[PDB]
Symmetry: D2
Subunit: 121 residues, 4 copies
């Protein structure tokens, strides 16, 4: 879903996800979080199923953002794993994992889990 995926999306927190789906299954763009140890735009890189089944199932995809830009460094990375669902109201349903660089003593508590829903709004 190159055409489909490409665009500007917003999640339930007001975060902005600007993507471009390459023909070769590549995802590139920008991410800006409405919350956490972040400010402005961050670079994102990902991959998506460029030849989705024809039975009307969603398109599997994922992307990563290392929380470092010119303004700051949170020393953490988030990965979103979900599927794209086309139609009237297109959506991107995901689950994410946010990992903080920690000392070994604190690795037990290095990762958060949640889910975000994106819509063209």
């Amino acid at each position: 879903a190159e055409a489909g995926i490409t665009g500007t999306w917003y999640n339930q927190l007001g975060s902005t996800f600007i993507v471009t789906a390459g023909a070769d299954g590549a995802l590139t763009g920008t991410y800006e979080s409405a919350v956490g140890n972040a400010e402005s735009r961050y670079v994102l890189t990902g991959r998506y199923d460029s030849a989705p089944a024809t039975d009307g199932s969603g398109t599997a995809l994922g992307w990563t953002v290392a929380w470092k830009n010119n303004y700051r460094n949170a020393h953490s990375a988030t990965t979103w794993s979900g599927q794209y669902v086309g139609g009237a109201e297109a959506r991107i349903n995901t689950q994410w994992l946010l990992t903080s660089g920690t000392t070994e003593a604190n690795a037990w508590k290095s990762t958060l889990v949640g889910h975000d829903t994106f819509t063209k709004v």
Copy 2:
């Protein structure tokens, strides 16, 4: 950890992860799974904290693989979120999310969760 991260790594299942850490916090390479609906090498893309804290904490990183290559298409994507830990025995500790494109009726069961440990072996 450009030097550190760059290399060939193996996880507890015998999977092979070949990465190159760019100066700009970019991760590119190849992934080959010892299990699941996969065969041969797949393209990977990710990001890592290119300016890790100096207190000896790990380096946050993540990558994605869309399970499609010339030989097959599993119509799924995996995202690994973890941290790189340097030293005598360098390691990459991660947690992953594997999402399958599904119909809406089956979205409840679209995603698996697990953890992989990588070592230069």
Copy 3:
């Protein structure tokens, strides 16, 4: 939130959760799934924060269901971890982990992850 938590709840899939919150932080009841390898009612057991903060934060709680009753056995267990949020429209926001008994060769793929929202409806 004994009074609050006690009751019949439904999630986004039409599943029914009948709980009783004991004074001692115990949760007991029945669970019936609208999907998966299940039928009829299953026993549940859990625990909740019986002395929640007074700043208006949610109440942390969790419960488990081993997918075996008189009618069947799916040889799996689900654990829901979330928080109770009181008010006009009371809700229970959770994340769950569903683990299937597997052989060692297949342990990599033994666990699913998702989220359910419950309301008195």
Copy 4:
């Protein structure tokens, strides 16, 4: 695995899990954490597959601990979802979700994810 499961177990962090597996698929016992906002013993409640497959697959199980005892209250709950694996070196492989009661503004970051391995040691 009543006999099998019943006992004292330790995870990779030095935490102690004392369980009793009831004939009816009930789990009761005590949990004491070597880390986090905890001290002494906490009550646990869970469920397990009391009639596991005969093909030598693991036994699915889960338990919860609300982090409140006489000494303190962390206003959080953990749920462990895994499987019991019998034999020479019996093990309990799990994944857990730790949820903190939070305000709505901070719900995005309410839950941690990790994995623990238990052995009779």
